[PDB]
């Protein structure tokens with residue numbers, strides 16, 4: 001079986017966080033991110049993976065992944081995937097992308113499916129500080145497989161980037 005145990009709306013990074021450091025200039029570890037190991041409760045042979053989607057406009061790329069725009073001065077590199085940050089999938093484009101191939105819980109056991117979102121600020125153009133307001137990032141949806149079904153359970157959660165400031 002499967003049930004939604006997370007939050008529909010999720011903020012990425014601490015509110016009003018401040019970060020210090022040619023163009024494009026990339027900054028922040030997992031500081032600006034959201035992580036939750038328990039978003040869906042799964043059991044009895046349920047198989048599930050994750051799809052991720054970024055709604056921000058694409059304004060450039062770096063080493064194979066999109067640079068998403070926030071302001072004409074600030075951009076973002078984004079990763080979505082399974083719970084642990086190191087397993088994040090670098091995001092490109094604005095379509096739903098497979099960000100976690102998935103796994104199946106035991107035939108007679110219960111566990112959970114989590115996720116993580118991480119971003120790193122990028123200075124596209126310069127002015128001394130750069131501020132960013134609360135902005136919608138995108139979403140992540142569970143992807144059942146092997147015949148498993150989501151039934152009427154909530155499959156998608158959304159993410160918003162909390163406001164932050166970048167200091168040169």
Ligand SMILES: CO[C@@H]1O[C@H](CO)[C@@H](O)[C@H](O)[C@H]1NC(C)=O
Nearest residue numbers: 037038082083103111112113114
């Ligand atoms: C079995 O552990 C579970 O594996 C899944 C797939 O890697 C993770 O999404 C999930 O968060 C994790 N749950 C916990 C409590 O750690």
